[PDB]
Amino acid sequence: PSRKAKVKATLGEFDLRDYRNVEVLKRFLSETGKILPRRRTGLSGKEQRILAKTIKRARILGLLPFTEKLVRK
């Protein structure tokens, strides 16, 4: 049930409010460009709420995607 090491574990310190850290933010998006749930992010209510605001900033800047196509099916 979504158990493959939460994205927070496999990662170090990072400014959750930094909308430019693509290499870090990129981690919180799925195969698609969708924001991973908390079961996967591992973040907390308060953290996750800031992740979202951050990511949505990245997207508008073009640094991050809104949607991805799935390779398989």
Binding site: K69, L70, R72, K73
Partner: protein, 119 residues
């Protein structure tokens, strides 16, 4: 005839019919088919079988253009989406990849009554 050798295969699944479109690397159609092109004309166009035939018709027609390998692209849900995916693979055509690219709005247009009250 024109010779492409490598291109794309689009599968438009629907609960009412499936239609396949083969295209050159730039997305311009070369040939196409569908449950209607083959015999079927009522509710059978939706059938997984019809999708199969439509898929094979597409490939063959695209053999005439000397095409050999394709990149499958799937759109929509629909009884007989997967049969197409399979019909192609097993048909001379080398399936290099399969990619689902069904369009989904970030919620913009109000659905017809028939498709509301969802979620």
């Amino acid at each position: 005839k024109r010779q492409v050798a490598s291109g794309r295969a689009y599968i438009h699944a629907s609960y009412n019919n499936t239609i396949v479109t083969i295209t050159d690397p730039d997305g311009n159609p070369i040939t196409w088919s569908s449950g209607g092109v083959i015999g079927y004309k009522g509710s059978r166009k939706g059938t997984p079988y019809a999708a199969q035939l439509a898929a094979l018709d597409a490939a063959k027609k695209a053999m005439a253009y000397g095409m050999q390998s394709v990149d499958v692209i799937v759109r929509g849900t629909g009884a007989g989406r997967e049969q197409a995916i399979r019909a192609l693979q097993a048909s001379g055509l080398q399936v290099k990849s399969i990619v689902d690219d069904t369009p989904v709005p970030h919620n913009g247009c109000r659905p017809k009554k028939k498709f509301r009250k969802a979620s």
